[PDB]
């Protein structure tokens, strides 16, 4: 179970099929949240908390902060 | 060796796709590398052509070619990209990773 | 109706498999050592009816462990 | 050259299938022979993986392999075979001929 | 276009409407007895079988000591009779 | 949709010009050989057109008539 912010009831979503919780920020505004597919094998989406271990992409002058985790209601904060 | 789902990591910065792909920076794709030698195994979902093709290669390797170890079922991943300056989210980015290899 | 056959192919996960018919395959490439394959068969039984060739000979039996010690032969 | 539908004739008597196939004695299948060099053409119906694969092959040819020229659409042929001593007729013997090649 | 051929196993009283550019085929065993008739797929593509008559140009397969005579043609109701050479 | 006629300079070309949704210019040499320029049409896989130019590939796409004729590209070093 994760939070939801994509263009369920008012900011929550039940992520099924082994999907993980993802959260996107720009640093700090909040961009999007929701489910993240476990396929692709991201070494950072099987974390216990939303931790930005990866270097942010140089796009947008280095603002986008992304992290994922595999626990319920973990994408509420980094 | 044999037809096998060998691992492959696609770093989006190496192919220049980080300009529009926010997340993930990379994903564990898979490549099908190997040889398709007769008899063609059934777990490689062979076709009647690939079976008829490899048989002619056994007679004369010049007239025909062997079957190739190619992906047979591709599964989607989740991405966060930039469409006209707005962050867009796609749950099913189809055909990015390899789930089943096979001989065609 | 599944049957338990003998597995002697490089693709084998165990000494025995389960399938519809058992298979024995002889696969000699020109100027190369003949290879004998033992396994199961769930599709494409049209192969089992093939005349033995100088490079391939297909064999299929529908009995319990019938493909244990089946020895095949290729045309000259 | 490139991924192309090169011709190939399968004589059923030469592969030992004439023991059960009465007609036809042979049929013009088709083989996909060539290389899949970037840019991958759209008439070969490429996938997102095969395109991502060839891009990594451009950077380092050791980490990844080129896309393979494999059949993408297989069409059936008509046969006359012998089932239990009786001449049987099959209008759609699936997966015998190749109509479209592509890189996967 | 759509080619009607003879039948010997919608079909209705010895005929069949072969669609999608399929050709007429006819099989015999030679005392020339008639085995089967009907439609033949153009995807077999021996040469696309755009012949006007059923001509057994190929030597009969070595099974049954060379009795089965098979041919296809691209005209309507052409699989009724065959030829040689 | 509104199709556009582009210039065809790829080995896969059936004629001097093709018709498609967007025109494409591709530069495709990493190392070991001299860069090769490709001109053609694009009806699918627009995700390539938005890729940062790399040392081996550069993608450009425009939606105007014969816009990809005399576009000169460059590869990173």
Keywords:
heterohexamer; A: 78 residues; mainly beta; three-stranded antiparallel beta sheet; 0% helix; C: 76 residues; two-stranded antiparallel ribbon; globular; Activin receptor type-1-like (chain F); Bone morphogenetic protein receptor type-2 (chain E)
Give your account of this protein's structure:
The complex is a heterohexamer, with 2 copies of chain A, 2 copies of chain B (104 residues) and 2 copies of chain C. Chain A is an all-beta fold. Chain A has strands spanning 2-3, 12-13, 20-26, 29-36, 64-69. In chain A, the strands form 2 sheets. A 3-stranded antiparallel β-sheet of chain A has the order 4-3-5, with no helix packed on it. Chain A is globular, with a radius of gyration of 12 Å. The two termini of chain A are 16 Å apart. In chain A, 36% of the residues are buried. In chain B, the strands form 2 sheets. In chain B, strands 2, 4, 5 and 6 form a 4-stranded antiparallel β-sheet that branches. Chain B has a two-stranded antiparallel sheet with strand order 1-3. Chain C has one domain (1-76). Helix content of chain C is 0%, strand content 37%. In chain C, strands 4-3-5 form a 3-stranded antiparallel β-sheet, with no helix packed on it. Chain B binds chain C through residues 2, 37-39, 41-43, 46, 48, 51, 55, 58-59, and chain C through 9-11, 23, 25, 27, 29-30, 37, 39-44, 47, 53-56. Chain A: Disulfide bonds join 2-21, 15-35, 45-68, 50-67, 69-74.
- Write the element-wise H/E pattern of chain C from the N-terminal end onward: EEEEE
Order of helices and strands of chain A: EEEEE
How do the strands line up in the largest sheet of chain C? Answer: 4-3-5
Query: Assembly type of the shown chains?
Result: heterohexamer
Query: What global shape of chain C is seen?
Result: globular
**How many structurally independent domains of chain A?**
1
Which pair of chains forms the biggest interface, and how many residues does each contribute? B-D, 30 and 31 residues
User: In angstroms, what separates the terminal alpha carbons of chain A?
Assistant: 16 Å
What is the number of helical segments of chain C per DSSP (H or I, 4+ residues)?
0
Q: Helical residue percent of chain A?
A: under 10%
Task: Please estimate the helix content of chain C.
Answer: under 10%
Instruction: Profile the largest sheet of chain A.
Output: 3 strands, antiparallel
- Could you give the order of strands across the largest sheet of chain A? 4-3-5
**Number of β-strand runs of chain C:** 5
Cα gyration radius of chain C (Å): 12 Å
The description of the largest β-sheet of chain C is: 3 strands, antiparallel
Sheet/helix structural class of chain C: mainly beta
Family (chain C): Belongs to the protein kinase superfamily. TKL Ser/Thr protein kinase family. TGFB receptor subfamily.
Organism (chain C): Homo sapiens (Human)
Glycosylation sites (chain C): 69
Subcellular location (chain C): Cell membrane
